[model samples]
Target: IETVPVKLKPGMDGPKVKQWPLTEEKIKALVEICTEMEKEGKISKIGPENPYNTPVFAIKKKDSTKWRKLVDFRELNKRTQDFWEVQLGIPHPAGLKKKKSVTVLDVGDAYFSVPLDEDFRKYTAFTIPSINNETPGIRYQYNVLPQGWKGSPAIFQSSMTKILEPFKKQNPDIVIYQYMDDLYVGSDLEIGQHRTKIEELRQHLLRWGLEPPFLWMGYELHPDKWTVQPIVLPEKDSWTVNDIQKLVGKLNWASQIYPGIKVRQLSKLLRGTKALTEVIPLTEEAELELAENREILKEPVHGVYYDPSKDLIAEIQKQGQGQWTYQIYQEPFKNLKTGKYARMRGAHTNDVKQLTEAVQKITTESIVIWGKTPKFKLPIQKETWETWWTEYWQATWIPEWEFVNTPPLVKLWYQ
Candidate 1:
C-alpha cells in the first residue's frame, strides 16, 4: 500500500525554532532515548541544513524521576491545514444484539510504527540542545511518523485501518471496533471461541510489528485545577498552553462518559486561548459554571429478585483481602427445601473468626432437613437459575421495560 507523506500547505516553507533548555538529568535521558531510536532505525542523525527544524521539550515522566522527549512542531503545524476525515467516537458495544464477549487491545507508540518515506524525513527534522561536553548539539530527523506532526493521527489511523482489514474479513462473527490505537474485538460466541479470535488478532498485530509495550490488559475533569473558587483571575502568565490543553483534553474525555456536563459552553470560553501561552483569566461566569459542573459530578444517587429456592447469602469480605462471610439479611425469608428461616444479607468485617463463622453458616450443617420433600428438585444454582430466568424474563417481561422505543413513566437507567 502506498503511504502519503506529511504535506505542507502550498507556499509554506519549513520553520525552525530555538531549543528549549533542559536539566542535566533530562538532557541525559533525552539523548538516551534518541540514541536508542537511532539504533532501532526509527530516526537518524542529520546535518543542520534540513529545511525543517523544531525544538525538543522534556516532559516529566509520570511517577518517576525521568523525562520524556517531545517535539514542538507548532510553527509547522500552523501552516498546514488539517483536512483529515472526521474522527470516530467510541463504539456503543453494549447496543450490539449478539455481542457476548469483549477484548481490548492497545497499539503502543502507534504513530511511530508507521514508516515515513525517506524524502519526507527531512521535513520532520528536530534539533536538540547540548546534551554533554562531548556533543554541543545534535540534529536528527525521524525515519518514522513522529508524534507531534499535524497529520500523524490521520496517517496512523488510515495505516492501521488497512492493516486490520484482513482480520475483519477473516472473522465474520467478530465485531471489531477501533478508536485510534485501541482495538476492541467482540463476538457472540462462547468464551472459548471468543478467546481464540482474540489470539488470532494478537498474531496479526505481531506480524505487523504493532505489538503494544505491555500485555493489552484492561476520568472526570478537575474544575479546581482550571480555576480557583469565587472567581479569581489566575496570576498573570501563570497558565501555559499545555495547562489549558491538559484541562481541555481531560474535559473532552470526560464528556465521553458523562455527556451531561456543558462542555460545549466551556469550549467556547476557551475559544482563542486554547493554544495561547499566556495565563488564562478566569471570568466570574466561567467560575460559576466550573463550580456547577463540580456539583453535578458530586451529586449522589440512591443506588431486584428471583426464585426463592436456593439459600441466598450476602457475603461481604473485608473489602479486598478476606474470606466471604454469610450474614443475616435485614428481612428474613424461608428456604422451602431447608424448612428453616434464613436471612440473605452480607456483613463487612476483617476478623478471621467472622470469616470462618460466615462460611460455617452456609455449610451442609447450616441447612435444615425437612421431613417432606418435593417430587422433583430443580437446579437452583446461580448460573442454572440465570438460564431459567432468561427464558422466564423473555416470556414474562419482554417489552416490559419501556413502551417499545419510547421512554417509560419513570426514568430507566438502560434498555
Candidate 2:
C-alpha cells in the first residue's frame, strides 16, 4: 500500500492535497456507495476532489488510544471567556418546584451491526490525509460535521425541536422545558399533564420516525408520572451542603416514591464522577455504599463529602412511596440555606475559559434573540418567586442585564 500526503488550504477552498490515490475498482465501489446514499438524500454530490481535506478513501491504522495528544487550542476560549461573561450571565436552570411525579427519557443505543451512517450520524468518521512531516494533530484534523451528518448531536436537537414544536402549538395548556435531549413537559396544575405530554410527544416523534427508548420512565412500575423536582445535580462544588441536606430530607420524606431508598450509594456515585444520579435513594445497596463512603470521606480537591448515614438511610427506607422526601423524624421546617460555592471545583483554568466563552455566546445570542417588548407593561404583584429571582439577578456582580438593557430586549424578524 502507498500513501500520499494531503495539504490544506488556509481558507475553506485554497489548494487541497491529494492523499489517497484510489485505483479504478476501489473508486467505483466508493462511488456506488455514494450513489445509493444520494438516492436517500443522505449526501450531496462528491466530486473527484477532497471531501473535507480528507482523502476520498482514508483510514487510520493506528489505535486512537495510543494517538499523540493534539496541540492545545485553549487560547481562543481563554480570550473569549471574559467577553462571554461580559455578554451573558452564567446559564442556570430558571425555576424549580416540588411535585409528585418524575419522568426520565433516554435515547436508544447505536446499531452495533450497521456502521454508523457517515452523513446523518454527525461527522465523527472523516480524517485528513497526512502530508509531509506534519502529523495532523487530533484537534487540527478533527472536524465537527454539519447538522444531520454522522455524529450530529446538533442535528438531533434541531430535529427534535422541529418535531415537538407543533405539539406545543396544538396543546395550549402544556408547557415545555428542554435541555438538550432531556425533555420536561408538564403544567402547573399537574392534572393529567404527564399523560397528555407523553401521548402528544410519542405521536409526534412516531410521525417523524424518531424512536426513543421503550423501557424508559419505569413506565410499568410508575406509569404516567414524573418527579417534577430536582433529583440530581453535578457533584463537586455544584451541590452545596445546604442543598444536599435539603435533598436528603426530601428523599427521606418521599421514601414511598423510592422503594429501596439508599442515600449512601447515590453519594458515592456522585462523588466519583460528573454524572447524574437520581435513583440511589431508592435502592438499599446504594444507601449502604453511600453511608460507608461518608464515614471515611476525605475533603477532595473539589468539595467536602457529606456521605449519607445509616440513620438517614433507615429514615428514607421507612417512608414509603408517594410521600415527601423531607418528612424525616427530624424537624421538617428546618431551613436549608444555599451552600457556599466550591472555589477549586469551579475554577479550573481550562473550564473557566470554556465557561466564559459559553457565557459570551449565550449573552450575544440572547441579545439578538430576546431584545424588545411593547411599552404598555401591565402592573402586577411580585410573587415570592418573582421577587427572589429578581433579587438573584441583581446580586450577580456582573451587570449582564445592564448589557441586555443597554440596547433593550427586543425581537423583530420579518418573514
Candidate 3:
C-alpha cells in the first residue's frame, strides 16, 4: 500500500505518547483485532519503535456490543504543518434546489482506504494495553491511512475527486456533490438516467477499492423532535474531548438550518479544554439555554420588524414576553426628559414578506416619535446606524436586543 507523505512543522520534536487504561475484555479484543489486521496486511508490528507514538481507545457501536478501535492523533496533528492541497468544502443543505428525487451514497471506511506513505507510518504507531497482566503491551503501526490525522480528509478528497472525474464528465446531466465521504447525486433527473449513472459511480468506487454503503432518496433533517443533552460519563461531571467533538459536529450541522443554534456557548466551553480526558462542565444555565433554543426550533417561524412611523409605544411597553420577536430601528433616539436612549417596538408578523417591506421603509433620516409627540431626538449619525443594521442583517435572521445606553432596545433586524 502506497501513502501520501506527511509534512511536520519546523522544530518538531516527538512527544512521549502514553496508553489509556482498558479492561481485560476490551484489551483482549483490541489485541485480537490487531493480530487479524496484521495478517490482512492492514497493520504491522513496529520495528525498533519510534518515539512519535499515539494512544488508542475503543468505542462501542450504538446498536451492537462490539467495539471499534480509534487512535488519538491530536499530538501529531498539532506538530504537523498544514500542506493539505485540496479544500473540502461542502455546500450547505439550503443551497440544494428542491428535486424530485436525490441519491445519497456513503463511502464506507473512507479514511482507511487511503494508504499512508511508508516514511510517515512510523509517526502513526500506537501503543495498546497488555492483554495479559504479566506481559508487556504491543505497539502496532497502521499500513493504511489513519483517522484523526489533520490531512486525511484533504488526501482522500483529492484522490476521490480524480477517481470520479471521468464518470462526472461522461454524465454532465447527473449533478454530484460531496461532503467528506458522503456523495449526493441529482435529485430531479430522469429515474433511468440516475440509475444508470449511479451504477457506474458504484463500479468506479469498487474498482478503486472504495465501498458505497447505500442509496436513498432526498430527505430533510427534522430536528424539532430531537433533544440535545450533554453525555453523562460514569463518575464524571465534565465533558471529554471526544464528547465535545461529537457535540460540535452535531451543532455545526444543525446550525446551517437552525438559526437558534448556540454556537457561541459551545465554542466558549470548547476553548477551556485541551486534552481528551480534560473536563469542561456544561453548567445548568447553558443546558437550559440549549433546551430553550431547541423548543424554539419546534415552533413555526414568525418574523418581526420595527417601523417607528406606526403607533409602537404601547407595544414597546409589553416586550420580553414572546418566544421569538425582533425589533428593528433606523436610528438611536434620545428621550428629552430622561436623557437616555428610547425603547423601540418591534412589529410581529407571521409572514416574512411584511418584515421585508417594513425594513425597506426605514431610512437614514427616519424620525421616531414617542407617542403622538416627537419627544425623541436622533442621537447618532445616519451612516453609523445604517452600518450597524446592515451588518446585523447579514449575520442572522433571528432578532435580538441591543443596548445603546442603560436601557436595552430590541434591535430592529432579525439576527
Candidate 4:
C-alpha cells in the first residue's frame, strides 16, 4: 500500500516550536499523556532530527479529570500541499435524515493510531515542555497519523471509504455514512434491532486492521429530541472573545439541530473588529445572558416530550427571581413596557404538567434552578409572568405546542 504523503509547499518551513507556555497542571498532563502514547506505540521519543515540529496544547476534560492533548498543527498543516483537492467527503449526515435508526461506529481515540509510513513520522514530531531542570523538554514523533494535521481526517476517511466499499458490497442492506472516524450505520429497523449484523460489521472493520475501541452512540427511531448537556463556561471576570468563540463553537453544532436560541443576545460580544481578541468586560445583561444560554442549553426545553392536550407553561430565572406562565413559542411574545422580554437569574428547568395543575402552579410552586444558588427555590407566585421573555425559559409550553402544532417550528424557536 502507498504511504500518506507529507509533502511541503515551497519555503513554508520555520517549524520547531518549544512548548506553548504550560501551567504546572498542563505540564503534568503532558507528561502523563505523552508517556502513555509512547508506551502504547502511537508515538516515540525522538531527537530533534525531525525538521518539522508542532506545538501541542491540552484542554482539561469537562469532568476535569483528564486532558485532551492536541497538537497545534496549523503551522505544520499550512505547509502540507494540496489538501482540499485530495479530501474525500462521505455522504453528508443530511442523507441520514430519512433513516429510521442510526448508530455511530466511532474509531474512538484510535483515529490517529492508524499507522503512517516510518519515513513520515518525523513530519508529525512534536516537542514537549521542560518540567524545570528535573526533566528536559523531549521531542516525540507520531508513529501513526498526526493528531491535528489538516490531512489526517481526509486520509483516514479515504482509507475508511476504501475499507467500507468492499464491506458494503458483501452486506448491501447496511447503509453506512462516514464522517472522519464516525461511521453511521443506518437501517429501517428500530433500535438495537440489527445489533448482530452491526456487531458483525464492527468485527469486519477490526479484521480489516482498524485498531480496537471502535465505539458508537445510539440514536432512537423517534429522533428529533436531544439534550444539550450544559457546557463549561469561561469565567465572567476574565474571558476573551476567543473564549466565547470556543463556547459558541462547541455549542454551535448542537444549536444547529435546535437553533431556536437568538444570536442577538450575543450582538454585544460580537461587536467591534477586535472583539475576537479583546478582553471585553461583559455587562451584567451579557453575563446573565451567558448564564441563561448555559442553562437553557443544558437541557433543551424544545426537545422535552410533553402532553399536547394539556395547557403548557414556560419558566425563567435571573438574579434570584423566577417565573412560570403559560405561553407559545412560534409567535414571539413581545412586551410593550420593557426593553427585555423576561428577566430572572438566567437559570431555568423544564417540565410538562397537566392543565389541572398548570395554572395554579404558576404563582406558588417550586421549580428546579440550575441546581445552583441559595439554599432553595422561591414561591412560584411572585415569579410568574404573562409573556415569553428573551430565550431563557423551559417548560412544556414550547415543546408541547410544537408536538400539536408544527414540529418544524419547535426546532427553530428557542427560549
Off by over 4 Å in 1: 1-3, 58-68, 81-108, 131-134, 166-204, 210-415
Candidate 3 displacement at residue 181 in angstroms: 5.8
lDDT of 4 by residue, 1-415 (tens): 4566666777765466655566677677778888888898888988755666776656532223446575666566656665556643332444353455656554535456577767667777777776564676778888877655655666676667777787789877766764333355766665556676677776777777623532433322322321222334455567688876665654554455445544445556767777566776767776766777666555434444433233333322221223232332221331101111222322334321122133222311111111001111222332232112111221111111111222223221222
Clash counts for all predictions: 2, 42, 12, 16
Q: Between 2 and 4, whose lDDT is larger?
A: 4
Query: How does candidate 3 score on lDDT?
Result: 0.49
Q: Write the per-residue lDDT of candidate 1 for residues 8-32, one digit (tens) a residue.
A: 6788776767665555765777789
In model 2, which regions exceed 4 Å deviation?
A: 1-102, 107-158, 189-193, 210-415
What is the TM-score of candidate 2? Answer: 0.26
lDDT of each: 0.48, 0.30, 0.49, 0.50
Which runs in model 4 stand beyond 4 Å of their true positions?
Answer: 14-18, 21-33, 39-41, 49-52, 57-69, 84-93, 108-120, 130-134, 170-173, 194-198, 210-415
Report how far off residue 343 is in candidate 3 (Å): 39
Compose the digit string of candidate 3's lDDT tens values, residues 1-415: 4666776788886545777566677677788778877897778887664765787765443223555565666677667777635543433343233344455554525667668777777778887777555686688888776655655656677777787788878876555655433365654556676576677777776777723223221222211222222212123356776676666565555454356767566566677538877667776765665566566556433333444454322112112322222222233321111111112334343222222222322210121111111222222334454334321121001112222333333221111
Q: List the residue pairs that clash in candidate 1.
A: 314-345, 314-346
| Ranked candidates, highest TM-score first | 4, 3, 1, 2
RMSD of 3: 22.9
Write down the lDDT that model 4 would get.
Answer: 0.50
Candidate 4: worst-modelled 10 consecutive residues by lDDT? 365-374
